[PDB]
Curated annotation (Swiss-Prot):
It is linked to Cornelia de Lange syndrome 6: A form of Cornelia de Lange syndrome, a clinically heterogeneous developmental disorder associated with malformations affecting multiple systems. It is characterized by facial dysmorphisms, abnormal hands and feet, growth delay, cognitive retardation, hirsutism, gastroesophageal dysfunction and cardiac, ophthalmologic and genitourinary anomalies. CDLS6 inheritance is autosomal dominant. Ubiquitously expressed. Belongs to the BET family. It is found in: Nucleus; Chromosome. Interacts with p53/TP53; the interaction is direct. Interacts (via CTD region) with CDK9 and CCNT1, acting as an associated component of P-TEFb complex. Interacts with RELA (when acetylated at 'Lys-310'). Interacts (via NET domain) with NSD3, CHD4, BICRA and ATAD5. The interaction with BICRA bridges BRD4 to the GBAF complex. Interacts (via NET domain) with JMJD6 (via JmjC and N-terminal domains); the interaction is stronger in presence of ssRNA and recruits JMJD6 on distal enhancers. Interacts with NSD3. Interacts with NIPBL. The record marks 101 as: Acetylated histone binding. The chain holds residues 44 to 168 of 1362 of the full protein. This is Bromodomain-containing protein 4. It comes from Homo sapiens (Human). Chromatin reader protein that recognizes and binds acetylated histones and plays a key role in transmission of epigenetic memory across cell divisions and transcription regulation. Remains associated with acetylated chromatin throughout the entire cell cycle and provides epigenetic memory for postmitotic G1 gene transcription by preserving acetylated chromatin status and maintaining high-order chromatin structure. During interphase, plays a key role in regulating the transcription of signal-inducible genes by associating with the P-TEFb complex and recruiting it to promoters. JQ1, a thieno-triazolo-1,4-diazepine derivative, and I-BET, a benzodiazepine derivative, have been tested on tumors with success. Treatment with GSK1210151A (I-BET151, a I-BET derivative) has strong effets on mixed lineage leukemia and promotes myeloid differentiation and leukemia stem-cell depletion.
Length: 129
């Protein structure tokens, strides 16, 4: 894409040790699957394209970008060592939205619907085995 958007977050790095855990499997097969198909998922399914959206200040404000397209790749390509890393990526995505946008805004209400679902699912994150 555009040189004016940053490169996306890292999804592949052989130097980073990787592991499958039952918790990570749940994050893919339950959590991500649920949020991805939500009616309000589409703004969060790829990095924010600040050029196309005419938001030239977006990456001036948001210095830790994250999105569900990145998280999906990270889960499908086994990037993580543990569930906390992946939960932190979800939380970063929500908090970016809430920091950049006004509390009324449609994108915020969309993020909040996904976050409510997320919380319900994370409360049932299985014990690590
Ligand atoms: O099971 C599937 O086919 C599937 C498809 C998309 C996503 Br996101 C999660 C899934 O688990
Ligand atoms: O600025 C944002 O947070 C944002 C993200 C994705 C889309 Br699509 C529109 C937006 O306004």
């Amino acid at each position: 894409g555009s040189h004016m958007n940053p490169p996306p977050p890292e999804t592949s790095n052989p130097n980073k040790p990787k592991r499958q855990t039952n918790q990570l499997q749940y994050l893919l097969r339950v959590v991500l699957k649920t949020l991805w198909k939500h009616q309000f998922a589409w703004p969060f399914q790829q990095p924010v394209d600040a050029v196309k959206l005419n938001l030239p200040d977006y990456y001036k404000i948001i210095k830790t970008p994250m999105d569900m397209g990145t998280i999906k790749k990270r889960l499908e390509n086994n990037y993580y060592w543990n569930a906390q890393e992946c939960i932190q990526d979800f939380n970063t995505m929500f908090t970016n939205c809430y920091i950049y946008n006004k509390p009324g805004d449609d994108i915020v209400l969309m993020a909040e619907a996904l976050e409510k679902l997320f919380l319900q699912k994370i409360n049932e994150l299985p014990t690590e085995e």
